[PDB]
Structure formats: structure tokens, C-alpha cells
Amino acid sequence: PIVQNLQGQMVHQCISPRTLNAWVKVVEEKAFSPEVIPMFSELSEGATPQDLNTMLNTVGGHQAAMQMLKETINEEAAEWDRLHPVHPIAPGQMREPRGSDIAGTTSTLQEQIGWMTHNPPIPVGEIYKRWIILGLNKIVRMYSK
Amino acid sequence: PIVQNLQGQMVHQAISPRTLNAWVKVVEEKAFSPEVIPMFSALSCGATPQDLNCMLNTVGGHQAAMQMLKETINEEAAEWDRLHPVREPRGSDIAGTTSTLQEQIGWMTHNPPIPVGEIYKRWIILGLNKIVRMYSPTSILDIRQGPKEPFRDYVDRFYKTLRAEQATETLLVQNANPDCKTILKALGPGATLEEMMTACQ
Amino acid sequence: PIVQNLQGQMVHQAISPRTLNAWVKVVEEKAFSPEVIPMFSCLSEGATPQDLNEMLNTVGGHQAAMQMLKETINEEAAEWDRLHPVHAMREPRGSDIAGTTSTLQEQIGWMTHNPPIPVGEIYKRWIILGLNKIVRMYSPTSILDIRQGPKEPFRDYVDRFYKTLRAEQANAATETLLVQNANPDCKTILKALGPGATLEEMMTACQ
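^ Those are the sequences you sent over. The predicted structure of the assembly is below.
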């Protein structure tokens, strides 16, 4: 995740083993009960796209659900590109992120941190987490009998 | 776990006991389930070759898998030297076998940086991939929906298996049971998984 | 360990209760299984000789094994003396590197000198040498007694074989023995694969 250092600057921090373990256990134990979603939102505070992918990829079972989630992410990525096309200039500001950059597939960790910690910040972690939550909502609804 | 937020020099934080134990436990508990790969890649965030070796060397059980891993690491080290005949890091330096911690820090924090930690992690993951494929209990060809199996459960087994062989959804539809297959054929290509799971619910 | 206190004082750290408890737990739970050696080597990363001694003293048993480690370090301490005369801050003797006759401040001085005299890393090497000897000693089974069972999957036998091998050792010979010790059917297959086969290929063939 991104965190504030002792001098109040935005820096990258490794996802803790407590965070990693908590998420894996939630998913295993709650399955796709509704309470999965708020837990995800708590666990992923300040997460980069890479961190969000870590969380999704670490889930072992429920591969039907995870495949649905990947489809929803792809849909949201496509919609992003349609609505926010990329505008050869970098004076200290970066490129415009495309859908696949927000999903962490075609962006580097360094680029994600650059976007997230910019002034003004380009919230790629929050945007990706929105897409993920959209997907999880669908899964929760489907799995409700 | 490396950071430079120290003072005079970069601070390699000795990899935490929590991290080391979590990795050992994952391997012991999960056999070589595909989720081990992301887990490793996350537990080793920014880690130096020394830290990676620590993780691998602490693994009490499953020595057969590790040796395979050792073979794959050696293969990749040899390939590195063949492509980069060379201080500049050699294959065994990237694997942490013939490099010192200080040399590793020097390369990782150099300008331009030589990310020896990330290169080594990549090689390890290459080896883990091979192991995961080995340890896949079922072929994709043997996943067919049972006459009384809910489609959700069949899809779960199907994609678990597919993940294991680290291709087409046409097989997913072809191996479904007669009723559900009939409906999936009618939905066409470009039906989403949500729509397919809804249709056979 | 080393840190830069205030302006940059080069002072000795603590060793964390979490580290010490994890180490104590490994030792109590895993006896002297070979994996304990890398684990020690990682838990003691950057340790001063005093820290290393603290870790070793906090063990909670295993008799004179430590004493065996003590013997090995004395031999190396004598070897250090042979190799380190009064050359052409002071020069470290064997007992200085082992933390018996050196002060914490001298240890820090050597470790933080330019050029640095890595007394912590040299002592750690000697400790590992002793632990390796212990592990080989505590090995309950000979490599020659790992034989694949009549109904045992090849993968399980290879797991047993390399576990034992690690203990016994800390090579062509070994892979030749691995094939020799397999059961009749899988041995037939392995012999059929020909020379130069990797362990991956051997495991695949008998799967």
C-alpha cells in the first residue's frame, strides 16, 4: 500500500503478512457472503493496483467467481478507454493511464506510485478498487440463493 | 525487505520472522496450489536475493519440489551468463550464491539500478510454475459436468484446473451437460460468464 | 546489529523479542532438522558476535552440542590466530571474533571501520560450520536406507530422499543412487530415459 512516512510524504509500503493472511482467510471462511465486500474495502486501504491484484490472485478456490470478476474488470477497463482516451510529454507529470494500467496489467509499480502520489493525485488504486467492488457486488448477488 | 529510509546508508531490514514463517506455512499447508505463486510474489516484496534464498531455504518439507526449483534456478543463471558475458553481476550473483549482501544492495540501489532481487524472483517463479503444473491433479480434458452437479460447482472445478496448467471457453461449453449446453449454445459467443452462470442456475 | 543514532553514532541495536521468540520456537519445535540452519542464518542477519552468542545461549537444551559448537569455534579461533599475526583500533584474535575477549565497542569499531573488518560475519560462518556438524550428527537415517516402497508414489520417495540427503550433507553419485533406490517398475522407466535427465523429467516419467 501507500502510507504516510514520519515526515508526511506518500511512500510505497509492502503489503503486510497480516493483511495478506486476513484477506485469504475472509474469502475462505465467508465465501461470498455480503460481508466480504466491506472487509475487502477495509483491508485494501491505500492499495496500489498491484496490491489489489495480489489480493484477488491469492484467493485459491471460488475460481468461477474470480473469473467473473476478471470479466467485470475487463468491461470497466473498456468503458474507461472509451470515456478517457490517452491524450509524448513528461516534464515531471506522467502518461494518462488506460484501463489496463488501472487494472495493473500494463502498468509498473513505479508508475502506479507516481500516479497515486502526484499533486493532484490520479487515484489509480481507488479507480481499480471501484471496478473490483462492482464485480464483487455481482458475485454476492449471484451467490445469494 | 529493503528500504533506504535510514540515514548514512540503505537499511536492509532483516526479513521479518512473520514473513518467513508465513511462507513456510503456506507451502506446508497449500501443497503447490496455484495461489502459492502470487503469495510468494507478495511476501517477497522488494526483497533482495538473500531474502529470497532465506525463504526458499527455510522450507522444511517437500524437498523434491525445491530441488526442481534449484535446477530451474541453475538453468536461468547459466542462461544469464550466456547472454551477458562479463562489478557486473553474474548468474550466481543474482541467485545470491556468490554475491555478498553489500554487493546486492549496491546493484539494487545503483544508478541505473540492476534489479537483481527482481531478476532472481522471476527465475524462482519460473521454477514454481513448473512445479505447480507438475502438481496439478487433473487434466482439463477430464473436467465434465456431472448430471446432478450444479453448474456453479462445475465452473469452479473447471477454472481451478485451468489455472493449474499455468485456453478456450468452447471446452467449458462442450463439456457442460445437455440442458445447460443447449442454452449456452443459444447465448452465442460473447456471452459473459455472469450470463452463462445465470442461464444454467 | 548496526544503526545511525542521532547525527550518526553507529550504535548497537536490540534484537527484537519477536525475532528471539521465533528462533526459540523453531528450535523447540523442529529439533535440529536441517532447515534450522538457514533460519538461524536469516534471523541473525547483521548480528554482532555478542548478538550471535545471545541467540545461541537462549537455546534451552541439547546438551554439550553447543559445547561441540564451542569446540569448533575454538579450532577456528586457533586457525584465526595462525592466519592473523600482529600485522606489518587493534587486529582481532580468534577469541575477539568469538566475542569472548573483545568489548562491544571494539566489535562495533571493527565492523564499522573503513575498511570494515567483518568480525560478526566471520563468527557467524564459524557458528554455521558448527551447526552443520550438529545437523549431520543428529541425522537419524542414512541416505542408503531411503528405498522406494512397493506401492509408494515416486514423488513421495524423492521427497524422502532429498530430505535425508540434506541432513546427511549440508552430484552424479546422488542421482545415480536415486535411480538405484527406486522400485523395480519406476527404475525400469528411469533407466530407459537415458543420461542427463533432470529431476523434473524423472518425476514426470514415474507419475
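Chains C and A do not touch (no CB pair under 8 Å). Chain C is about 60% helix and 0% strand.

Shout if you want it in another format.
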